[PDB]
Amino acid sequence: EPLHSIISSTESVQGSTSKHEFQAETKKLLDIVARSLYSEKEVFIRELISNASDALEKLRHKLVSDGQALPEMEIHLQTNAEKGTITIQDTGIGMTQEELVSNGVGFYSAFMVADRVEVYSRSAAPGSLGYQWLSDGSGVFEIAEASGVRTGTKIIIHLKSDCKEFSSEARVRDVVTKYSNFVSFPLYLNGRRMNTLQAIWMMDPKDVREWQHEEFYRYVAQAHDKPRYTLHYKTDAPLNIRSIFYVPDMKPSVALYSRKVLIQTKATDILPKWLRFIRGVVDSEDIPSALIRKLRDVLQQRLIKFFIDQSKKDAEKYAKFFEDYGLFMREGIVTATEQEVKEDIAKLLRYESSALPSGQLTSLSEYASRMRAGRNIYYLCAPNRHLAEHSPYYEAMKKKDTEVLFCFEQFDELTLLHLREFDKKKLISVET
Ligand SMILES: CC(C)NCCCn1c(Sc2cc3c(cc2I)OCO3)nc2c(N)ncnc21
């Protein structure tokens, strides 16, 4: 068995610790984080991992920048049921003495579950001394020079009396696989490797290719088919977004990460209700019921444009897509309030036309681009094609030289009825 242990008692303090009042901001902040900020107390494990990752990254960066060799870059967790402790060490960039004295606020979440926190840290900088940092989370911490400290940071948590659960390996394992499956550096628990998954949404879209997208699709959608559609969307311009969206090839939710770190597996609010058929992940740093709105919209127009290009890249596959998911588009159109929201989604609708061969579809805008200036969009629900063609109501439009849209289902017609008007033109039935 591949048992990797890097965690042991090498640290010793020769002198005495100097005592140290928190600054008036930090006392209140610590209590806010430890007693209010988070709703689930397990997330401390999450936060401490995040920090660890960060440390490691800038270490890595730094070294690769200076152009020197890379050491072991790992994150280790150790549980101890009888000392009743949980420990997290990283071999990343450490903390200088000033960095410890002065100030990664997620760290303080540790005091949500601990009644004493014990830290050993040593900067990666050349000729850096190790230091010990101690605190009961009141208003007093202690600082002392320590020896036998490895480069990086070791955080030892002495759990509260009824928080002993986080000294159990099974519990901690569950928490880890829950929030930290996609950690960017190798993570071990009690000697055993945990994370195997690659946060492929952080990648460059050009560097990810099919088998990866399939693996991840099956992961987040918990499915066995393949995605029929794939949109890898990165942006920094409006807000920060690293997202992947899949449309299942089976005919009939998105996870919210930030930090390559899970926040909610069921982010139903991140996409509009009519795009609930979409699978995948949204990763955004601008995420602490308002900005989620901002993001939800941003994703909505992004996805709409996506499906439009999909139409104009492969109209037959998109035709099938409209047959399998048009339900959601009609629902979303009727559901919308502001008009051109309705029209935006309406750009995804595909219907048969009198000026098109029976079987072929077009959109409203396509229709309009052949609509001779002069003002109205004509449609008609018949049971089938040839019945619409032989409707007197249409045969009044045949030699009147006008194109007419053909619906074959009541929900389509109700949709166009609700829509009322689309871009500088109203939708009228030829039975009016
Ligand atoms: C390098 C440092 C300036 N980055 C700021 C975040 C501080 N920090 C943190 S959060 C933190 C941790 C503390 C602390 C204050 C913070 I904020 O006092 C006792 O230990 N974790 C780090 C880690 N594993 N490696 C390197 N730095 C860490």
UniProtKB/Swiss-Prot annotation:
Signal peptide: none
Main location: mitochondrion
GO biological process, one term: negative regulation of cellular respiration
Keywords assigned: Acetylation, ATP-binding, Chaperone, Membrane, Mitochondrion, Mitochondrion inner membrane, Nucleotide-binding, Phosphoprotein, Transit peptide
Superkingdom of the source species: Eukaryota
GO cellular component, one term: mitochondrial matrix
Tissue specificity field: Found in skeletal muscle, liver, heart, brain, kidney, pancreas, lung, placenta and bladder. Expression is highly reduced in bladder cancer and renal cell carcinoma specimens compared to healthy tissues, but it is increased in other type of tumors.
N6-acetyllysine PTM positions: 164, 226, 234, 305, 312, 347
Record's keyword annotation contains Endoplasmic reticulum: no
Subcellular location, record wording: Mitochondrion; Mitochondrion inner membrane; Mitochondrion matrix
Any GO MF annotation of the entry: tumor necrosis factor receptor binding
Chain sites annotated for binding ATP: 51, 90, 103, 107
Phosphoserine: residues bearing it: 102
SUBUNIT field: Binds to the intracellular domain of tumor necrosis factor type 1 receptor. Binds to RB1. Interacts with SRC. Interacts with SDHA.
Family: Belongs to the heat shock protein 90 family.
Free-text function comment from the UniProt entry: Chaperone that expresses an ATPase activity. Involved in maintaining mitochondrial function and polarization, downstream of PINK1 and mitochondrial complex I. Is a negative regulator of mitochondrial respiration able to modulate the balance between oxidative phosphorylation and aerobic glycolysis. The impact of TRAP1 on mitochondrial respiration is probably mediated by modulation of mitochondrial SRC and inhibition of SDHA.
Protein name (database record): Heat shock protein 75 kDa, mitochondrial
UniProt source species: Homo sapiens
